[PDB]
Design a protein around this ligand. Structure first.
Ligand SMILES: *C(=O)CCc1cccs1
Lengths: 87, 7
């Protein structure tokens, strides 16, 4: 599908509310495998299971290993911009 | 086998 830009708002006491799988060491994108109900990704409305996360706040995630992506994603705070695509 | 992380 089309590449989308998606805004997510979170406070510092919560996580993003997603589960991710994949990573460059496995030859697969960073993929959203779960959206936790009621948490910030669910509330933002624009992120879905099956989406690949291509970038976050201008940081490219297309070539990142799994744990690299965890560190990058968990560092982001407040108003967070995602670049995502559903295949 | 792929890893999964809750974040
Ligand atoms: C979720 O964060 C996976 C790590 C686990 C936490 C409790 C059981 S497994």
């Amino acid at each position: 599908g089309p590449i989308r830009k998606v805004l997510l708002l979170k406070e510092d006491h919560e996580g993003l509310g997603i589960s991710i799988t994949g990573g460059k060491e496995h030859g697969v994108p960073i993929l959203i495998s779960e959206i936790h109900p009621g948490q910030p990704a669910d509330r933002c409305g624009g992120l879905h299971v099956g989406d690949a996360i291509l970038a976050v706040n201008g940081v490219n995630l297309r070539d990142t290993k799994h744990k690299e992506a965890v560190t990058i994603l968990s560092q982001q705070r407040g108003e967070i911009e995602f670049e995502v695509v559903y295949v | 086998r792929l890893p999964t992380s809750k974040i």
